[PDB]
Structures are given as C-alpha cells and as structure tokens.
Amino acid sequence: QAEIEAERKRAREELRKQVAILAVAGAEKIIERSVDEAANSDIVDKLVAEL
Amino acid sequence: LDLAKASATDQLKKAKAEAQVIIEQANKRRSQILDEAKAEAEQERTKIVAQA
C-alpha cells in the first residue's frame, strides 16, 4: 500500500503543470463566454487580461 | 484367567498405541491443515491492501 502514493502525487503535480497550462485556455474561453453572455454586444477591445 | 486377561491386555495396549498414532495423524493432519490455511490467508491479505 505504501508505494503507489508517491506516483499519485506526481500525477497531481502534472495536473498542476497542465493546470497552469490550462490557465491560458481559461482566459481565452473566459473572454469568449464573456462576449456570449454579454448577449448585448461584444467589444473585445476591452482587455480583461485574465490569466 | 490367564488366557482372558492376556488377550485383553495385548489387544488393549496394542489398541492403545494405534489410537495414539491416530491422534497424531489427526494432529499434524488438521494442524498442518492449519498452517496451509495461514499461508493462503496471507496471500488474500496482501492482495486486499494492495487493492487499497
């Protein structure tokens, strides 16, 4: 039972790498659905600059 | 008297030793049975907490 733990930890760590990696996409789709639910008009000019 | 008590004696003690042996047969018999049981159990356990 002891061993598997450390590996699982590494897995979550990669989830952190890909997590920060995902931060990008979250900024992207972030502004995206921002315009969608804006549902009034979309000015992408304003830069939220979300991470 | 001699004939009777003699036969009874011999058959008696012979029967005795036989019995003792039998007890031994059952002894390490079922006992060994116990040991093997111990082993198998061990396997199952390692499996279980591994699964954990």
PDB file of N, CA, C and O in Angstrom, chain A:
ATOM      1  N   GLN A   1       0.824  -1.194   0.000  1.00  0.00           N
ATOM      2  CA  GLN A   1       0.000   0.000   0.000  1.00  0.00           C
ATOM      3  C   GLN A   1       0.863   1.251   0.000  1.00  0.00           C
ATOM      4  O   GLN A   1       0.499   2.281  -0.578  1.00  0.00           O
ATOM      5  N   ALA A   2       2.038   1.163   0.614  1.00  0.00           N
ATOM      6  CA  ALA A   2       2.896   2.330   0.759  1.00  0.00           C
ATOM      7  C   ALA A   2       3.176   3.013  -0.577  1.00  0.00           C
ATOM      8  O   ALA A   2       2.920   4.210  -0.739  1.00  0.00           O
ATOM      9  N   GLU A   3       3.661   2.244  -1.551  1.00  0.00           N
ATOM     10  CA  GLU A   3       4.375   2.825  -2.689  1.00  0.00           C
ATOM     11  C   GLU A   3       3.526   3.767  -3.533  1.00  0.00           C
ATOM     12  O   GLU A   3       3.924   4.912  -3.757  1.00  0.00           O
ATOM     13  N   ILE A   4       2.332   3.321  -3.944  1.00  0.00           N
ATOM     14  CA  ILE A   4       1.607   3.970  -5.040  1.00  0.00           C
ATOM     15  C   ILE A   4       1.445   5.457  -4.782  1.00  0.00           C
ATOM     16  O   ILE A   4       1.307   6.270  -5.713  1.00  0.00           O
ATOM     17  N   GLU A   5       1.441   5.823  -3.508  1.00  0.00           N
ATOM     18  CA  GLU A   5       1.165   7.195  -3.120  1.00  0.00           C
ATOM     19  C   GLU A   5       2.029   8.178  -3.896  1.00  0.00           C
ATOM     20  O   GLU A   5       1.508   9.041  -4.614  1.00  0.00           O
ATOM     21  N   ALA A   6       3.350   8.015  -3.819  1.00  0.00           N
ATOM     22  CA  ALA A   6       4.270   8.977  -4.417  1.00  0.00           C
ATOM     23  C   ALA A   6       3.932   9.225  -5.878  1.00  0.00           C
ATOM     24  O   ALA A   6       3.870  10.373  -6.342  1.00  0.00           O
ATOM     25  N   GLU A   7       3.707   8.146  -6.620  1.00  0.00           N
ATOM     26  CA  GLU A   7       3.305   8.279  -8.008  1.00  0.00           C
ATOM     27  C   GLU A   7       2.059   9.134  -8.133  1.00  0.00           C
ATOM     28  O   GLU A   7       2.054  10.134  -8.865  1.00  0.00           O
ATOM     29  N   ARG A   8       0.995   8.765  -7.413  1.00  0.00           N
ATOM     30  CA  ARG A   8      -0.238   9.543  -7.470  1.00  0.00           C
ATOM     31  C   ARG A   8       0.065  11.023  -7.295  1.00  0.00           C
ATOM     32  O   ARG A   8      -0.455  11.884  -8.022  1.00  0.00           O
ATOM     33  N   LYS A   9       0.959  11.320  -6.350  1.00  0.00           N
ATOM     34  CA  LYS A   9       1.398  12.691  -6.141  1.00  0.00           C
ATOM     35  C   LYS A   9       1.946  13.294  -7.420  1.00  0.00           C
ATOM     36  O   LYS A   9       1.534  14.385  -7.829  1.00  0.00           O
ATOM     37  N   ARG A  10       2.881  12.599  -8.068  1.00  0.00           N
ATOM     38  CA  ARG A  10       3.412  13.105  -9.329  1.00  0.00           C
ATOM     39  C   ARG A  10       2.287  13.411 -10.307  1.00  0.00           C
ATOM     40  O   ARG A  10       2.279  14.460 -10.959  1.00  0.00           O
ATOM     41  N   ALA A  11       1.318  12.502 -10.406  1.00  0.00           N
ATOM     42  CA  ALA A  11       0.189  12.716 -11.303  1.00  0.00           C
ATOM     43  C   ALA A  11      -0.482  14.045 -11.028  1.00  0.00           C
ATOM     44  O   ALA A  11      -0.681  14.855 -11.942  1.00  0.00           O
ATOM     45  N   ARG A  12      -0.830  14.292  -9.768  1.00  0.00           N
ATOM     46  CA  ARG A  12      -1.422  15.576  -9.425  1.00  0.00           C
ATOM     47  C   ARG A  12      -0.488  16.722  -9.795  1.00  0.00           C
ATOM     48  O   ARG A  12      -0.935  17.794 -10.211  1.00  0.00           O
ATOM     49  N   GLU A  13       0.821  16.514  -9.646  1.00  0.00           N
ATOM     50  CA  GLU A  13       1.772  17.564  -9.989  1.00  0.00           C
ATOM     51  C   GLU A  13       1.664  17.926 -11.460  1.00  0.00           C
ATOM     52  O   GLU A  13       1.591  19.104 -11.824  1.00  0.00           O
ATOM     53  N   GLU A  14       1.653  16.914 -12.323  1.00  0.00           N
ATOM     54  CA  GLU A  14       1.400  17.153 -13.733  1.00  0.00           C
ATOM     55  C   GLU A  14       0.074  17.860 -13.925  1.00  0.00           C
ATOM     56  O   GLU A  14      -0.054  18.734 -14.783  1.00  0.00           O
ATOM     57  N   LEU A  15      -0.928  17.490 -13.131  1.00  0.00           N
ATOM     58  CA  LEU A  15      -2.188  18.214 -13.174  1.00  0.00           C
ATOM     59  C   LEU A  15      -1.977  19.680 -12.832  1.00  0.00           C
ATOM     60  O   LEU A  15      -2.746  20.542 -13.262  1.00  0.00           O
ATOM     61  N   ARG A  16      -0.938  19.982 -12.052  1.00  0.00           N
ATOM     62  CA  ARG A  16      -0.636  21.375 -11.749  1.00  0.00           C
ATOM     63  C   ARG A  16       0.061  22.038 -12.920  1.00  0.00           C
ATOM     64  O   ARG A  16      -0.212  23.199 -13.244  1.00  0.00           O
ATOM     65  N   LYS A  17       0.967  21.315 -13.568  1.00  0.00           N
ATOM     66  CA  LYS A  17       1.621  21.850 -14.750  1.00  0.00           C
ATOM     67  C   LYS A  17       0.600  22.142 -15.833  1.00  0.00           C
ATOM     68  O   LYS A  17       0.437  23.285 -16.262  1.00  0.00           O
ATOM     69  N   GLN A  18      -0.124  21.112 -16.257  1.00  0.00           N
ATOM     70  CA  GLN A  18      -1.249  21.280 -17.158  1.00  0.00           C
ATOM     71  C   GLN A  18      -2.299  22.201 -16.576  1.00  0.00           C
ATOM     72  O   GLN A  18      -3.153  22.687 -17.307  1.00  0.00           O
ATOM     73  N   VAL A  19      -2.263  22.452 -15.277  1.00  0.00           N
ATOM     74  CA  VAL A  19      -3.255  23.332 -14.685  1.00  0.00           C
ATOM     75  C   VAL A  19      -2.887  24.735 -15.122  1.00  0.00           C
ATOM     76  O   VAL A  19      -3.643  25.396 -15.840  1.00  0.00           O
ATOM     77  N   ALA A  20      -1.710  25.187 -14.693  1.00  0.00           N
ATOM     78  CA  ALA A  20      -1.180  26.452 -15.171  1.00  0.00           C
ATOM     79  C   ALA A  20      -1.276  26.547 -16.684  1.00  0.00           C
ATOM     80  O   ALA A  20      -1.596  27.605 -17.232  1.00  0.00           O
ATOM     81  N   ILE A  21      -1.002  25.443 -17.374  1.00  0.00           N
ATOM     82  CA  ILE A  21      -1.189  25.400 -18.819  1.00  0.00           C
ATOM     83  C   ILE A  21      -2.625  25.754 -19.162  1.00  0.00           C
ATOM     84  O   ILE A  21      -2.900  26.511 -20.101  1.00  0.00           O
ATOM     85  N   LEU A  22      -3.562  25.230 -18.383  1.00  0.00           N
ATOM     86  CA  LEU A  22      -4.969  25.457 -18.648  1.00  0.00           C
ATOM     87  C   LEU A  22      -5.373  26.885 -18.346  1.00  0.00           C
ATOM     88  O   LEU A  22      -6.359  27.367 -18.914  1.00  0.00           O
ATOM     89  N   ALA A  23      -4.629  27.568 -17.472  1.00  0.00           N
ATOM     90  CA  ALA A  23      -4.933  28.958 -17.160  1.00  0.00           C
ATOM     91  C   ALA A  23      -5.130  29.773 -18.426  1.00  0.00           C
ATOM     92  O   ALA A  23      -6.086  30.552 -18.526  1.00  0.00           O
ATOM     93  N   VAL A  24      -4.258  29.580 -19.410  1.00  0.00           N
ATOM     94  CA  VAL A  24      -4.368  30.212 -20.716  1.00  0.00           C
ATOM     95  C   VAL A  24      -5.771  30.015 -21.273  1.00  0.00           C
ATOM     96  O   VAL A  24      -6.524  30.979 -21.467  1.00  0.00           O
ATOM     97  N   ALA A  25      -6.125  28.753 -21.525  1.00  0.00           N
ATOM     98  CA  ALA A  25      -7.416  28.446 -22.125  1.00  0.00           C
ATOM     99  C   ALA A  25      -8.560  29.040 -21.317  1.00  0.00           C
ATOM    100  O   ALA A  25      -9.593  29.421 -21.875  1.00  0.00           O
ATOM    101  N   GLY A  26      -8.387  29.136 -19.997  1.00  0.00           N
ATOM    102  CA  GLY A  26      -9.432  29.711 -19.170  1.00  0.00           C
ATOM    103  C   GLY A  26      -9.581  31.203 -19.387  1.00  0.00           C
ATOM    104  O   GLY A  26     -10.684  31.745 -19.324  1.00  0.00           O
ATOM    105  N   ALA A  27      -8.463  31.889 -19.619  1.00  0.00           N
ATOM    106  CA  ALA A  27      -8.536  33.282 -20.037  1.00  0.00           C
ATOM    107  C   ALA A  27      -9.247  33.402 -21.373  1.00  0.00           C
ATOM    108  O   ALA A  27     -10.113  34.266 -21.570  1.00  0.00           O
ATOM    109  N   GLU A  28      -8.879  32.532 -22.308  1.00  0.00           N
ATOM    110  CA  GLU A  28      -9.453  32.525 -23.643  1.00  0.00           C
ATOM    111  C   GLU A  28     -10.963  32.360 -23.599  1.00  0.00           C
ATOM    112  O   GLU A  28     -11.714  33.316 -23.827  1.00  0.00           O
ATOM    113  N   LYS A  29     -11.410  31.147 -23.273  1.00  0.00           N
ATOM    114  CA  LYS A  29     -12.837  30.869 -23.184  1.00  0.00           C
ATOM    115  C   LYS A  29     -13.499  31.809 -22.189  1.00  0.00           C
ATOM    116  O   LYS A  29     -14.706  32.062 -22.258  1.00  0.00           O
ATOM    117  N   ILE A  30     -12.708  32.335 -21.256  1.00  0.00           N
ATOM    118  CA  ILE A  30     -13.209  33.317 -20.303  1.00  0.00           C
ATOM    119  C   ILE A  30     -13.779  34.518 -21.039  1.00  0.00           C
ATOM    120  O   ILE A  30     -14.965  34.854 -20.913  1.00  0.00           O
ATOM    121  N   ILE A  31     -12.940  35.165 -21.843  1.00  0.00           N
ATOM    122  CA  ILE A  31     -13.422  36.280 -22.649  1.00  0.00           C
ATOM    123  C   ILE A  31     -14.497  35.801 -23.616  1.00  0.00           C
ATOM    124  O   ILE A  31     -15.451  36.525 -23.932  1.00  0.00           O
ATOM    125  N   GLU A  32     -14.359  34.564 -24.095  1.00  0.00           N
ATOM    126  CA  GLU A  32     -15.286  34.056 -25.100  1.00  0.00           C
ATOM    127  C   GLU A  32     -16.720  34.062 -24.589  1.00  0.00           C
ATOM    128  O   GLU A  32     -17.596  34.754 -25.130  1.00  0.00           O
ATOM    129  N   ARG A  33     -16.972  33.317 -23.518  1.00  0.00           N
ATOM    130  CA  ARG A  33     -18.305  33.309 -22.947  1.00  0.00           C
ATOM    131  C   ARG A  33     -18.662  34.670 -22.383  1.00  0.00           C
ATOM    132  O   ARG A  33     -19.845  34.994 -22.251  1.00  0.00           O
ATOM    133  N   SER A  34     -17.658  35.478 -22.036  1.00  0.00           N
ATOM    134  CA  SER A  34     -17.952  36.862 -21.685  1.00  0.00           C
ATOM    135  C   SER A  34     -18.736  37.542 -22.794  1.00  0.00           C
ATOM    136  O   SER A  34     -19.765  38.172 -22.538  1.00  0.00           O
ATOM    137  N   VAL A  35     -18.273  37.416 -24.034  1.00  0.00           N
ATOM    138  CA  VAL A  35     -18.992  38.027 -25.146  1.00  0.00           C
ATOM    139  C   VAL A  35     -20.316  37.313 -25.370  1.00  0.00           C
ATOM    140  O   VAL A  35     -21.342  37.939 -25.663  1.00  0.00           O
ATOM    141  N   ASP A  36     -20.307  35.986 -25.253  1.00  0.00           N
ATOM    142  CA  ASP A  36     -21.541  35.237 -25.464  1.00  0.00           C
ATOM    143  C   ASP A  36     -22.645  35.738 -24.548  1.00  0.00           C
ATOM    144  O   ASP A  36     -23.695  36.199 -25.009  1.00  0.00           O
ATOM    145  N   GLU A  37     -22.398  35.697 -23.245  1.00  0.00           N
ATOM    146  CA  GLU A  37     -23.403  36.105 -22.278  1.00  0.00           C
ATOM    147  C   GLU A  37     -23.533  37.617 -22.224  1.00  0.00           C
ATOM    148  O   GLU A  37     -24.481  38.137 -21.625  1.00  0.00           O
ATOM    149  N   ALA A  38     -22.574  38.336 -22.806  1.00  0.00           N
ATOM    150  CA  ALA A  38     -22.737  39.765 -22.989  1.00  0.00           C
ATOM    151  C   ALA A  38     -24.100  39.918 -23.614  1.00  0.00           C
ATOM    152  O   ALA A  38     -24.921  40.716 -23.153  1.00  0.00           O
ATOM    153  N   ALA A  39     -24.330  39.146 -24.674  1.00  0.00           N
ATOM    154  CA  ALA A  39     -25.656  38.930 -25.232  1.00  0.00           C
ATOM    155  C   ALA A  39     -26.346  40.253 -25.499  1.00  0.00           C
ATOM    156  O   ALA A  39     -27.573  40.334 -25.567  1.00  0.00           O
ATOM    157  N   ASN A  40     -25.535  41.293 -25.634  1.00  0.00           N
ATOM    158  CA  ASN A  40     -25.971  42.653 -25.879  1.00  0.00           C
ATOM    159  C   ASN A  40     -25.125  43.140 -27.036  1.00  0.00           C
ATOM    160  O   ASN A  40     -25.627  43.407 -28.131  1.00  0.00           O
ATOM    161  N   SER A  41     -23.829  43.234 -26.791  1.00  0.00           N
ATOM    162  CA  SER A  41     -22.852  43.398 -27.846  1.00  0.00           C
ATOM    163  C   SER A  41     -21.515  42.921 -27.310  1.00  0.00           C
ATOM    164  O   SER A  41     -21.337  42.757 -26.099  1.00  0.00           O
ATOM    165  N   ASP A  42     -20.581  42.695 -28.216  1.00  0.00           N
ATOM    166  CA  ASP A  42     -19.252  42.222 -27.865  1.00  0.00           C
ATOM    167  C   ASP A  42     -18.236  43.249 -28.338  1.00  0.00           C
ATOM    168  O   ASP A  42     -18.067  43.457 -29.543  1.00  0.00           O
ATOM    169  N   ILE A  43     -17.569  43.896 -27.391  1.00  0.00           N
ATOM    170  CA  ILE A  43     -16.384  44.677 -27.686  1.00  0.00           C
ATOM    171  C   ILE A  43     -15.237  43.906 -27.063  1.00  0.00           C
ATOM    172  O   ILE A  43     -15.047  43.944 -25.841  1.00  0.00           O
ATOM    173  N   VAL A  44     -14.464  43.216 -27.899  1.00  0.00           N
ATOM    174  CA  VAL A  44     -13.274  42.523 -27.440  1.00  0.00           C
ATOM    175  C   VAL A  44     -12.127  43.480 -27.227  1.00  0.00           C
ATOM    176  O   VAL A  44     -11.070  43.079 -26.719  1.00  0.00           O
ATOM    177  N   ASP A  45     -12.305  44.741 -27.619  1.00  0.00           N
ATOM    178  CA  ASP A  45     -11.291  45.757 -27.387  1.00  0.00           C
ATOM    179  C   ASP A  45     -10.880  45.792 -25.926  1.00  0.00           C
ATOM    180  O   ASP A  45      -9.693  45.671 -25.605  1.00  0.00           O
ATOM    181  N   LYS A  46     -11.848  45.945 -25.025  1.00  0.00           N
ATOM    182  CA  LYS A  46     -11.521  45.942 -23.611  1.00  0.00           C
ATOM    183  C   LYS A  46     -10.812  44.644 -23.272  1.00  0.00           C
ATOM    184  O   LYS A  46     -11.349  43.553 -23.468  1.00  0.00           O
ATOM    185  N   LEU A  47      -9.602  44.766 -22.750  1.00  0.00           N
ATOM    186  CA  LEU A  47      -8.780  43.610 -22.430  1.00  0.00           C
ATOM    187  C   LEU A  47      -8.920  43.366 -20.938  1.00  0.00           C
ATOM    188  O   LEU A  47      -8.407  44.140 -20.123  1.00  0.00           O
ATOM    189  N   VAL A  48      -9.624  42.292 -20.583  1.00  0.00           N
ATOM    190  CA  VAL A  48      -9.688  41.901 -19.182  1.00  0.00           C
ATOM    191  C   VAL A  48      -8.324  41.432 -18.718  1.00  0.00           C
ATOM    192  O   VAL A  48      -7.966  41.601 -17.548  1.00  0.00           O
ATOM    193  N   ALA A  49      -7.536  40.867 -19.629  1.00  0.00           N
ATOM    194  CA  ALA A  49      -6.235  40.285 -19.326  1.00  0.00           C
ATOM    195  C   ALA A  49      -6.344  39.317 -18.147  1.00  0.00           C
ATOM    196  O   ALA A  49      -5.727  39.482 -17.096  1.00  0.00           O
ATOM    197  N   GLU A  50      -7.158  38.290 -18.362  1.00  0.00           N
ATOM    198  CA  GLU A  50      -7.349  37.226 -17.392  1.00  0.00           C
ATOM    199  C   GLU A  50      -6.245  36.201 -17.593  1.00  0.00           C
ATOM    200  O   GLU A  50      -5.768  36.006 -18.713  1.00  0.00           O
ATOM    201  N   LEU A  51      -5.804  35.586 -16.506  1.00  0.00           N
ATOM    202  CA  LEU A  51      -4.738  34.605 -16.608  1.00  0.00           C
ATOM    203  C   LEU A  51      -5.294  33.258 -17.029  1.00  0.00           C
ATOM    204  O   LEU A  51      -4.536  32.377 -17.407  1.00  0.00           O
TER     205      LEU A  51
END
